[PDB]
Amino acid sequence: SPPAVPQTFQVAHLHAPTGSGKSTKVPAAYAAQGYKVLVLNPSVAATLGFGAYMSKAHGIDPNIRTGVRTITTGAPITYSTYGKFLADGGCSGGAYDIIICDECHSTDSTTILGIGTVLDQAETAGARLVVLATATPPGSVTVPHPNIEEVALSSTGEIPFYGKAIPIETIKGGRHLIFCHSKKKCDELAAKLSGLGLNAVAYYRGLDVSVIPTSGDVIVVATDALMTGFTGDFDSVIDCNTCVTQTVDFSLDPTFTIETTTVPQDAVSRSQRRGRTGRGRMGIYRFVTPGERPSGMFDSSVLCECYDAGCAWYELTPAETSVRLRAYLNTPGLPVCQDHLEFWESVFTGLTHIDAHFLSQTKQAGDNFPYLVAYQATVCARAQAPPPSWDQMWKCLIRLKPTLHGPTPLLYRLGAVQNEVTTTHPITKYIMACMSA
Amino acid sequence: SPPAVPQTFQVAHLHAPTGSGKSTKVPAAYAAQGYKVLVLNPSVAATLGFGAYMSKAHGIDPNIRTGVRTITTGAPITYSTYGKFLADGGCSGGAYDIIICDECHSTDSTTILGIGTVLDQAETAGARLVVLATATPPGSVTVPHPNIEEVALSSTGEIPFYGKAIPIETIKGGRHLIFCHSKKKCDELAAKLSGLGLNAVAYYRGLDVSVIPTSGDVIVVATDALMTGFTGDFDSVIDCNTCVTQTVDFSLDPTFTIETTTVPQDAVSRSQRRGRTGRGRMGIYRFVTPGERPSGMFDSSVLCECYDAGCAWYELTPAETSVRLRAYLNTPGLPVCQDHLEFWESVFTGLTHIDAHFLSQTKQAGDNFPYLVAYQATVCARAQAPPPSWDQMWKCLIRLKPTLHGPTPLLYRLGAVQNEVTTTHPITKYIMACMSA
Amino acid sequence: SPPAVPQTFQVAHLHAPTGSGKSTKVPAAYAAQGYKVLVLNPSVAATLGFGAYMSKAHGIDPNIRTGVRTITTGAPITYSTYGKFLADGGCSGGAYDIIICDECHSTDSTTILGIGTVLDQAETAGARLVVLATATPPGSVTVPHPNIEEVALSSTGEIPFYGKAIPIETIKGGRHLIFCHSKKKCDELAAKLSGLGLNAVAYYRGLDVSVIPTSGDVIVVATDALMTGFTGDFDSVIDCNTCVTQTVDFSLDPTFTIETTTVPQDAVSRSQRRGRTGRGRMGIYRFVTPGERPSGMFDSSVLCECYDAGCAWYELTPAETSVRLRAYLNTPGLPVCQDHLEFWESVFTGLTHIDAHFLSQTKQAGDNFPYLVAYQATVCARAQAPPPSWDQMWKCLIRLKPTLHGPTPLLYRLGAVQNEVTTTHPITKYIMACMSA
DNA sequence: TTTTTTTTTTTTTTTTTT
Ligand SMILES: Nc1ncnc2c1ncn2[C@@H]1O[C@H](COP(=O)(O)OP(=O)(O)O)[C@@H](O)[C@H]1O
Ligand SMILES: Nc1ncnc2c1ncn2[C@@H]1O[C@H](COP(=O)(O)OP(=O)(O)O)[C@@H](O)[C@H]1O
Ligand SMILES: Nc1ncnc2c1ncn2[C@@H]1O[C@H](COP(=O)(O)OP(=O)(O)O)[C@@H](O)[C@H]1O
Ligand code: BEF
Ligand code: BEF
Ligand code: BEF
Ligand SMILES: [Mn+2]
Ligand SMILES: [Mn+2]
Ligand SMILES: [Mn+2]
């Protein structure tokens, strides 16, 4: 199955079910042929997990690169998150022979930006083979997994769960993973369970991977933070079947609107979440709702998110970000999306001289679109105007409340707007013009 | 006055004037007898308020449950909003001995749904006593309050107010609460006052309770968001005496019409609004219009609103919602309403496969009947037809404007209809048939 | 031309052709002299339009007040509709030095009520100068406009239009405004044109001003909603030369009759409609019928309409409305009308205790004389009698159809009467007596 | 059959990863 290493640059695909070994066996086999391999994964939990596992199961301590930890052993295999890969400047000269873009079904800005970067610097960097691996390629439907029994949940059960219920004897003893669409529910559920006599713990972006015991009975309640790549040796998985996504609406009021919505999971999500169990042994998968929506395409808001990440986290200029997204969108076999690069690039190119103090605050707060949020805060402060509203999202301005007054120079809509609004700010006019043509 | 805890399940009533302590002293006294008590209140502002107050006045940090915050201390008393109670799945097995349905005069869908839920799961959950508390029972007239002087407003005053006027020296210094029937007026009035040298602030569903200072001179302009349960230590209250309500009209054109109207407040509203002052000390109540209309009965539109909330917010099937409303309507001592359960249940049972993206948008927009609005949007999009009109209510479809064409498949009337209309859509025919018999 | 600001109160007139700048340059020049200016305009479209224009053409973001939007910048100029002015309580103490009553040729109840209010509170409010501005004073004939070529329409053309025809090449490309006497024709025409390949859109009271693009080729089909104050940068205007007006007939059968009729436009209307083009550049004006009827006087039905508006929208008692209309009728240079204040005041003074639910419904339905309509509905319901007929105007009673029976207690005639009629109701007898002397 | 303008205008509790 693994693509043979060609004598000249080449991008190939690798498709195999969840748990088959695309992230472990494959890269090992390549190393065995005397090749230097880099494996990029979107999950921090999974990346760190390869360190320990590859150690005691393949006798090879690989190099590990993540925001949390770094281990340089000098082995021929390196596991890194896409995020850490971008923050390190991308490809190194003659650093690797093969680069494996793992979980290339991920449609988060960092993975898109990362894979684009690879597809744009790989050959020049001296790599002979780039591999796009995933168990759920762009246009694919959920297929039965040999190790996973799929059992729907009913209304019987002492624990309420998205309309259905979870029977305690179903998670009393053993290792189990419960997917919840938001951190808030993860917290409540984990609590509900702990207050029952169960060893429950919650996990999501922001918490420490150590919270998950390597062994022993445990019930982990998490978000899509544990959706891909991760192996937690779970006997079962309970999926709410819902997910949080973002959409962009060009409502010209005055510019665009980025709305976060909770919707039914798509095929990719269902297969990946299900895939957290049945890894090297039989497992059970319990769900709330059957079926799902098709995949293969992602919203233009994701592109917006890439420019924002490029500007806020990876010191990439809009132009530079374009070159990378272009490589991605022009490569066959990946998720497709409306070509709005020019538009988004021209938008962000206008957002200059942002307040560093504000940017820093929205990044550390975990805000979505930290750059756009902070930029709007910047514009407001400079106009001594209040933010769109006074909710958490704009706390970085509460400190100026006594001086701020008048209408808000709305640049775009990132949430609810309560204060009066003015649409005459230069940037607003510039964005509208970027939309008119 | 407080009902004694029986040895077997029993639902009792508790009626006492506003500010007497039904939501604080009573639940404390029960806890003192070694009982676990749950207090459900419709107000988020009031619920959070019990946290701090019960702390420094009854030396007992209770558990707090609301959409905004959660505090699990482990105390024998828990304060929760009806909304948060429903979103948590309802009653917990052997979680409480007594459940107090506070402010059971509230006729909003969430309170009705909540109380029904309690009256349907309480005994089975192991509760021995359910208490229905309020200062304004179903068929009751406004009675004089010992701490409140009622002074009508006149035409003298620099601030215009619903036909009358408010004298500045009447609110210059001290703490005051001004009731306005809509957020729009709350905003204008608060502005008018701030631009006078007064510390004014507006408050309604959507803003943050923190906007109201714990102490110091302040003038709060709010909607019925601060009508019940809340204690803000106000020296006075100024009431516009008007309120926003909803009505359903079975106009068979083609189906029904839900109309929002501004009308004179009823007795319940007058006593509750008045009751925001005179809490533990003398207070003043100024009004625009005297007298009021009788209470005890609510419009069938409220039931419609419950099914819609059940479907949009609490993951309840129409059938499940019916079981809860039935418990409510069959319990003596509560507000009565036409028994249209069967009808409304059959209506919503037909509205399936709604677009999640649309539902999500109408919920976050605060639209009334978010499910019906979104469902109509769904039907339109699927027929590539435009919405009833192009006002804010249908913005979620503006994005398809270029493709939408032809007449609107009107399912029912939720507002003004400007575009041409077709009444042949399956759902429309189904609704008409639900009405014919 | 602009009246100099006197040291003591004074009401002056300002007459200048359409598009000369009475609503923009003039108020700016006053602000330049360190004066605070309020500009009242009857059009919502025009008012919002001043916001953007004054911004990028006079570098001054003015305060904007309308039902749809509010922008408080703190500038020395404020633009407001008469409607919004009345709903805010009228004049503010020492809020402005100059009040400019724009488009004082408008004979709609709101403008009349508004200007009367100003002429009655201005001095007391501390204003030094009240200005009555218009391009078409009371007794004035249509005069040639230097920027407008007037070209009659013929029978040649593919688009039928009030007896004549419109040649497609006359509106194919460019910006054009077409006046139609009713919303129904606006809809059909706009459709007819869109179904030809033209970017056509309809506009009238009720739709959103956003429907009109700021630029690009467009054909707007509208009612007198775009008759005054508005600047849409149109290359031409096509006028049907007809308008909808109302008349009152004291037919003593039993009381009066208010009839809506379609008639030939008067001079004011022709000059104002023509004035939508040729604003800052040459334009074309095409018409169906030449000439027109003289202006300067309006029907007693307008006064009736003021009391009704005062009662239904501006919380004004008949007595209060009289004080304002009196100020209007006693001020030289404005449109004159029969002095029937006493009569109309005594009529409305009798209409008390109207059903709020009905009033609310006729207001939201856009009915003319919403108060009188709703009052008649109220009387009927209280007598368990059916309405005058069963047409749209009385839909608010269809819901009682099964209980209503007998003759209709006709209070007056607002339309066709089909059901049997009784003239013995107290209110009817009271109205007749108000007419007898 | 064919057929009517213009400006004022709506609350409450559930709720978002990567
Ligand atoms: N961190 C780990 N802990 C325990 N087992 C692991 C771990 N990583 C991999 N494995 C084992 O190796 C198999 C292949 O894992 P992996 O390469 O991650 O699969 P995938 O094809 O999904 O990328 C799994 O089925 C599992 O049994
Ligand atoms: N949050 C609070 N802040 C200050 N005082 C409070 C608060 N809550 C309750 N109180 C005091 O306790 C009394 C009883 O309050 P409460 O139980 O809420 O009354 P009710 O009978 O209306 O339910 C009030 O009159 C007031 O003096
Ligand atoms: N909203 C607008 N958009 C474009 N031009 C405008 C606008 N408002 C005013 N103008 C320009 O300024 C001139 C004066 O407009 P205005 O003050 O409204 O005239 P009027 O004398 O009719 O009240 C117009 O001829 C036009 O060129
Ligand atoms: F396909 Be494996 F779950 F990364
Ligand atoms: F009766 Be209290 F005001 F809740
Ligand atoms: F006289 Be302008 F057209 F208001
Ligand atoms: Mn993998
Ligand atoms: Mn209470
Ligand atoms: Mn003008």
Q: Of B392, B400, B345, B386, which Cα lies nearest the Cα of B367?
A: B392
Judging by beta carbons within 10 Å of its beta carbon (0-12, 13-18, 19+), is residue B152 exposed, middle or buried?
exposed
Q: Which tokens in the block code for residue A179? A: 């997917």
Q: What residue's CA is closest to ligand 6, atom 1? A: C18
Taking a C-beta distance cutoff of 8 angstroms, is the pair C268, C335 a contact?
no
Strand, helix or coil for residue B374: helix
Q: How far apart are the first and last CA of chain B?
A: 47
Distance CA B379, CA C191 (A): 23
Quote the radius of gyration of chain A (alpha carbons, Å): 23
Distance CA B244, CA C78 (A): 30
Taking a C-beta distance cutoff of 8 angstroms, is the pair C60, C129 a contact?
no
Which residue, counting CA atoms, is nearest to the C1' of nucleotide D16? A260
Give how far the C-alpha of residue C233 lies from the chain's centroid of Cα atoms, to the nearest Å. 22
- Report residue C122: phi and psi, to 5°: -45, -60
Strand, helix or coil for residue C138: coil
Distance CA B313, CA B286 (A): 37
Distance CA A214, CA A217 (A): 10
Judging by beta carbons within 10 Å of its beta carbon (0-12, 13-18, 19+), is residue B351 exposed, middle or buried?
buried
**C89, C356, C364 ranked by CB distance to B160: nearest:** C89
Strand, helix or coil for residue C114: helix
Which residues, 6+ apart, have CB-to-CB distance to C69 below 8 Å?
A: C48
Is the Cβ pair B262, C360 closer than 8 Å? Answer: yes
Sign of CA dihedral B210, B211, B217, B221: negative
Q: Of A305, A304, A282, A184, which Cα lies nearest the Cα of A235?
A: A282
Q: Of A411, A418, A428, which Cα lies nearest the Cα of A369?
A: A411
Distance CA C61, CA C77 (A): 8
How many alpha carbons lie under 13 Å from residue A208 in its C-beta half-sphere? 5
Distance CA B191, CA C73 (A): 12
Greatest Cα-to-Cα distance within chain A, rounded to the nearest angstrom: 68
Sign of CA dihedral B362, B364, B368, B369: positive
Q: Which tokens in the block code for residue C69? A: 């939007």
* Cis peptide bond N-terminal to A138, omega within 30: no
User: To 10 degrees, what angle do helices B318-329 and B109-121 make?
Assistant: 80
Taking a C-beta distance cutoff of 8 angstroms, is the pair C261, C104 a contact?
no
Domain C139-242+264-295 in the same topology as domain C1-138: yes
- Report residue B131: phi and psi, to 5°: -120, 130
Q: Which ligand 6 atom sits closest to the C-alpha of C16?
A: 1
Q: Which nucleotides of D are covered by protein (CB under 7 A)?
A: 3-18
| Residue B345, marked binder | no
CB pairs under 8 A between B and C: 41
Q: Of C203, C240, C243, C241, which Cα lies nearest the Cα of C219?
A: C203
Is the Cβ pair C70, A420 closer than 8 Å? Answer: yes
Phi-psi region of C34 (alpha: psi -120 to 50; beta: other; left: phi over 0): left
Q: How far is CA A341 from CA A34, A260, A323, A345, B410, in A?
A: 39, 21, 9, 6, 39
Distance CA A366, CA A223 (A): 15
Task: List chain B residues with CB under 8 Å of C70.
Answer: 187-188
Strand, helix or coil for residue B363: helix
Taking a C-beta distance cutoff of 8 angstroms, is the pair A311, A353 a contact?
no
Q: Which residue has the tokens 């104002």?
A: C272
What is the three-state SS of C84-112?
HHHHCCCCCCCCCCEEEECCCCCCCHHHH
Residue type, A291: G
Q: Which tokens in the block code for residue A32? A: 């065995």
Taking a C-beta distance cutoff of 8 angstroms, is the pair C326, C363 a contact?
no
Distance CA B329, CA B303 (A): 11
B149 DSSP β-pair partners: B284
Q: Which residue has the tokens 């960097």?
A: A125
Taking a C-beta distance cutoff of 8 angstroms, is the pair B7, B48 a contact?
no
Q: Of A358, A409, A390, which Cα lies nearest the Cα of A255?
A: A409
Which residues, 6+ apart, have CB-to-CB distance to B25 below 8 Å?
A: none
Q: Do β-strands A257-264 and A242-249 pair in parallel, antiparallel, or remain unpaired?
A: antiparallel
- Report residue B18: phi and psi, to 5°: -65, 135
Q: Which tokens in the block code for residue C193? A: 């044109």
Q: How many residues does chain A have?
A: 437
Distance CA B77, CA B54 (A): 10
Q: Which tokens in the block code for residue A59? A: 């006798």
Q: How far is CA B270 from CA A317, B235, B264, B287, C360, in A?
A: 60, 17, 10, 10, 21
Quote the radius of gyration of chain C (alpha carbons, Å): 23
Q: Of A117, A209, A148, which Cα lies nearest the Cα of A18?
A: A148
Q: Which residue has the tokens 């290792």?
A: A175
Judging by beta carbons within 10 Å of its beta carbon (0-12, 13-18, 19+), is residue B15 exposed, middle or buried?
middle
User: To 10 degrees, what angle do helices A300-312 and A318-329 make?
Assistant: 140
Quote the radius of gyration of chain B (alpha carbons, Å): 23
Taking a C-beta distance cutoff of 8 angstroms, is the pair A66, A80 a contact?
yes
Chains that touch B (3 or more CB pairs under 8 A): A, C
Q: Which tokens in the block code for residue A411? A: 């640049």
User: To 10 degrees, what angle do helices C109-125 and C318-329 make?
Assistant: 80
- Report residue C421: phi and psi, to 5°: -130, 140
Distance CA C165, CA C187 (A): 17
Strand, helix or coil for residue C183: helix
Q: Which tokens in the block code for residue C296? A: 């300067």
Task: List chain C residues with CB under 8 Å of B163.
Answer: 315-317
Judging by beta carbons within 10 Å of its beta carbon (0-12, 13-18, 19+), is residue A158 exposed, middle or buried?
middle
Q: How far is CA A168 from CA A183, A192, A194, A197, A286, in A?
A: 22, 11, 12, 10, 13
Q: What is the dihedral of CA A405, A408, A414, A416, to 10 degrees?
A: 70
Judging by beta carbons within 10 Å of its beta carbon (0-12, 13-18, 19+), is residue B1 exposed, middle or buried?
exposed
Q: How far is CA A202 from CA A3, A165, A183, A190, C2, in A?
A: 39, 19, 8, 6, 73
Distance CA C50, CA C32 (A): 17
* Cis peptide bond N-terminal to B254, omega within 30: yes
Distance C102 CA to ligand 6 centre (A): 9
Taking a C-beta distance cutoff of 8 angstroms, is the pair C237, C179 a contact?
yes
**B93, B208, B356 ranked by CB distance to A263: nearest:** B356
* Cis peptide bond N-terminal to A254, omega within 30: yes
Q: What is the dihedral of CA B309, B313, B317, B319, to 10 degrees?
A: -30
Q: How far is CA A69 from CA A44, A208, A210, A217, in A?
A: 9, 12, 12, 27
DSSP H/E element including C119: helix C109-125
Per CATH, the homologous superfamily of domain A243-263+296-437 is RNA Helicase Chain A , domain 3 (1.10.820.10)
Taking a C-beta distance cutoff of 8 angstroms, is the pair C371, C411 a contact?
no
DSSP H/E element including C115: helix C109-125
Distance C279 CA to ligand 6 centre (A): 9
Q: From the candidates B399, B400, B401, which should be mutated to test the interface with A, based on the most A CB atoms within 10 A? A: B399
Nucleotide nearest C313 (Cα, C1'): D8
Ligand nearest to the CA of A274: 4
Q: DSSP states of C318-357 as a string? A: HHHHHHHHHHHHTSTTS-B----HHHHHHHHHH--S--HH
Distance CA B276, CA B270 (A): 10
Residue C89 has a CB neighbour count (10 Å cut-off) of: 19
Q: How far is CA B147 from CA A268, B124, B172, B280, B283, in A?
A: 64, 42, 21, 8, 6
Beta strands in B23-97 (DSSP E): 37-41, 63-65, 70-71, 77-81
Taking a C-beta distance cutoff of 8 angstroms, is the pair B131, B14 a contact?
yes
DSSP B351: -
Distance CA B84, CA B86 (A): 5
| Alpha-helical runs (H) found in C141-213 | 183-194
Give how far the C-alpha of residue C18 lies from the chain's centroid of Cα atoms, to the nearest Å. 18
Q: Which tokens in the block code for residue A244? A: 């949080």
Q: What is the dihedral of CA C179, C180, C185, C190, to 10 degrees?
A: 0
Give how far the C-alpha of residue A311 lies from the chain's centroid of Cα atoms, to the nearest Å. 17
Give how far the C-alpha of residue A217 lies from the chain's centroid of Cα atoms, to the nearest Å. 28
Which residues, 6+ apart, have CB-to-CB distance to B4 below 8 Å?
A: none
Distance CA C34, CA C29 (A): 9
Phi-psi region of A294 (alpha: psi -120 to 50; beta: other; left: phi over 0): beta
Distance CA A226, CA C362 (A): 57
Q: DSSP states of B258-295 as a string? A: EEEEEEE-BHHHHHHHHTTB-SSS-EEEEESS---B--
Residue type, A31: A
DSSP H/E element including B101: strand B98-101
Q: How far is CA B306 from CA A27, B111, B350, B369, C106, in A?
A: 56, 9, 16, 9, 47
Domain boundaries, chain A: 1-138, 139-242+264-295, 243-263+296-437
CATH class of C139-242+264-295: alpha beta
DSSP B397: G
Q: Quickly name the fold that domain C1-138 has.
A: Rossmann fold (3.40.50)
Task: List chain A residues with CB under 8 Å of B90.
Answer: 160
Taking a C-beta distance cutoff of 8 angstroms, is the pair B387, B376 a contact?
yes
What is the three-state SS of chain A?
CCCCCCCCCEEEEEECCCCCCCCCHHHHHHHHCCCCEEEEECCHHHHHHHHHHHHHHHCCCCEEECCCCEECCCCCEEEEEHHHHHHCCCCCCCCCCEEEECCCCCCCHHHHHHHHHHHHHCCCCCCCEEEEEECCCCCCCCCCCCCEEEEECCCCCCEEECCEEECHHHCCCCEEEEECCCHHHHHHHHHHHHCCCCCEEEECECECHHHCCCCCCEEEEECHHHCCCCCCCECEEEECCEEEEEEEECCCCCCCEEEEEEEECEHHHHHHHHCCECCCCCEEEEECCCCCECCCECCHHHHHHHHHHHHHCCCCCHHHHHHHHHHHHCCCCCCECCCCHHHHHHHHHHCCCCCHHHHHHHHHCCCCCHHHHHHHHHHHHHCCCCCCCCCHHHHHHHHHCCCCCCCEECCCECCCCCCCEECCCHHHHHHHHHHHC
| Residue C123, marked binder | no
Distance CA B411, CA B414 (A): 9
Distance CA A347, CA A363 (A): 20
Taking a C-beta distance cutoff of 8 angstroms, is the pair B411, B431 a contact?
yes
